[PDB]
Amino acid sequence: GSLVCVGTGLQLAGQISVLSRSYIEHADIVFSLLPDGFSQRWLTKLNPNVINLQQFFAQNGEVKNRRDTYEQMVNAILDAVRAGKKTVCALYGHPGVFACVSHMAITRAKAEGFSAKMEPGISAEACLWADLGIDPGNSGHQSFEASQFMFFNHVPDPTTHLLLWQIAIAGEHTLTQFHTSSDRLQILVEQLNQWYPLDHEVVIYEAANLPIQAPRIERLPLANLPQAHLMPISTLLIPPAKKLEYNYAILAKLGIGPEDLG
Amino acid sequence: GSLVCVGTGLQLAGQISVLSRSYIEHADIVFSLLPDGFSQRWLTKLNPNVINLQQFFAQNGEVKNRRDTYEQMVNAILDAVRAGKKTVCALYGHPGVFACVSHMAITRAKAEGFSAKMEPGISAEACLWADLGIDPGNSGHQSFEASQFMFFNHVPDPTTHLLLWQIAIAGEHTLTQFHTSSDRLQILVEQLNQWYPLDHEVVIYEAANLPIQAPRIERLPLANLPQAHLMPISTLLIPPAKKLEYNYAILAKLGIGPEDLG
Amino acid sequence: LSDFFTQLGQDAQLMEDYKQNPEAVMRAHGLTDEQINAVMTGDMEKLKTLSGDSSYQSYLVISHGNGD
Amino acid sequence: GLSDFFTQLGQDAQLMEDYKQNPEAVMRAHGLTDEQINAVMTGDMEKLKTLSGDSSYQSYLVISHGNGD
């Protein structure tokens, strides 16, 4: 048995890598986590032997910690590998970007003596740079999970493009609800106000999943975030609050100044 | 005329999107910037109408500001679009990630009334998460261009995975040399020592371009960076210097403590 | 509907035909007036209705911010 | 023959999984010389480019700078 984890990207059918599609084609069995029924149908036509990982999230209002959902997904993947199957895990986006299940399954598979690897894919952030026409190198980039930004000590550089992922569950500490509350988002706004003014323009971004669909690019003042319509897939982009300033200390050690910059 | 900018990913032939390959296939003309002659041959077999953008870098020891190279690349692309050609720009990686030519060409094309868009691709950072088994969500992620970190005021969060891109030209202020010096990298080490101890293990990462090739994953103490062999494609990964610590301030506003986290 | 979206996502020729004339391309691939209306108003929920997925359930959060 | 093999191997998951099982057997079966196989097993990318006749071709892959506006 063996494991390869691939990404399908965000867009239906066309955003998967040529090699990653060939892995899906030739797999004994595929474990899928895909955005919609169009994507599910496309996959099933590629390879009919598919187990849908969606079944492991809480059903019908059940209280279930997402840590247990993820453990159950990893165990299901590993059961196929342990049985001797040439196993592919086909996740949306990039299988290792804000996605624990593939990293955990590859760690466990290697520890049990099986061949396991991860093929990179096109993530929501890769779609954002393209859709917004932003280079993360322009003034640099920072990414945090929104709840981790609230629960632990993180300090953003306000010259950079800042991304808070999973903004829809920001401050949902139980890992048992699918969305947060407007009061939790108001506390996030107050926290961000240490670096960003309340009238600072921010962007709610959602990558499109269908070729006929435009991405969501909603611009609003930070103050208005707790009243905004958010979906599990939403990411909050916080553009720079300040322009780049000259690092005189280091320029002097280099024996140059601003006027010497090419 | 029209412009679509695509990425080819880092690996030969297999890391391009299904859709992005189809755009190259059906283009009137392709402007290429690819890692090697194997990639160039693969492209030429896909579409024989190729102009190689490599020609616009300084040749034979010429002194040329890279800003001029990039202008000349953008102008070449736009001349095909202005002539009426259905134009594709095929860059390695992601065409908009630490890559100015495609964003500039798309801005200019839109301003002159032509249809222009960018298709996301698999970048070197996407390859790194897969190769190192690191999720940027785990403790967060920050990316800066190494020289921009030295020349302007950037403050890293030392709980995150920190990436310094283009580390091989760190401090090369003229934009006319292809690599920096040992003394420039020693100044970067002293600068980073504000947040990272001198014995802090860092990683020199290079994504593989050929399917028979292993990525470069070189672990060394930060102090040893200025003696390291670096190539233009090298990225410096600086893993966390500190574990995540509880944000008691925000937990108190949420009315919870660490013991309440799911 | 599904066959059309799958072809359109993968085929740059059809994508560039579609972007020139969305309604003409959709009509030629058999999409109903209601389906085309759903596309032109960006109503992804009604498109899923019209493709009949017996509400296919799709939560795509695969990480958390609680550490450990 | 080098370039044809690498292009197939990079795109085809079946050949990739055959290759990873037995690199030398797969490379011999696709006609690679003893020197080419040696270059692959030692990770000498420069010699492979020599042997394909390509590296001579100039590849600088920096498409951005850190000097601002």
Residue numbers in the entry:
A (entry chain C), B (entry chain A): 2 to 263
C (entry chain D): 4 to 71
D (entry chain B): 3 to 71
Paste lines from the article.
Here we report the discovery of type IV borosin natural product pathways (termed ‘split borosins’), featuring an iteratively acting α-N-methyltransferase and separate precursor peptide substrate from the metal-respiring bacterium Shewanella oneidensis. The α-N-methyltransferase SonM from Shewanella oneidensis MR-1 iteratively methylates its substrate SonA at two residues, SonA-L63 and SonA-I65, in an N-to-C terminal fashion on the core peptide. Complexes of SonM and SonA form dimers of heterodimers. A five helical bundle at the N-terminus of SonA, now referred to as the borosin binding domain (BBD; 1–53), serves as the SonA leader peptide and is homologous to a portion of the fused clasp region of OphMA.
The two other active site tyrosine residues, SonM-Y58 and SonM-Y71, were also mutated to phenylalanine. Both residues mainly affect the apparent kcat, where SonM-Y71F is more deleterious than SonM-Y58F (~100-fold and ~10-fold decrease in catalytic efficiency, respectively). The overall structure is very similar to wt. Loss of the hydrogen bond between the carbonyl group of “i−1” and SonM-Y58 results in minor changes, including a slight change in the interaction angle (from 108° to 114°) and a deviation from amide bond planarity (Ω angle is 178° and 174° in wt and SonM-Y58F, respectively). The core peptide of SonA-2Me is hydrogen bonded to seven SonM residues via backbone interactions. Both SonM-Y71 and SonM-Y58 are both in hydrogen bonding distance with three main chain groups of SonA-2Me. The side chain of SonM-Y58 interacts with the carbonyl and the NH groups of “i−1” (2.7 Å and 3.6 Å, respectively) and the carbonyl group of “i−3” (3.6 Å). Kinetics analysis of SonM active site mutants support a previously proposed mechanism for borosin methyltransferases, where deprotonation of the target amide nitrogen is stabilized by residues SonM-Y58, SonM-Y71, and SonM-R67.
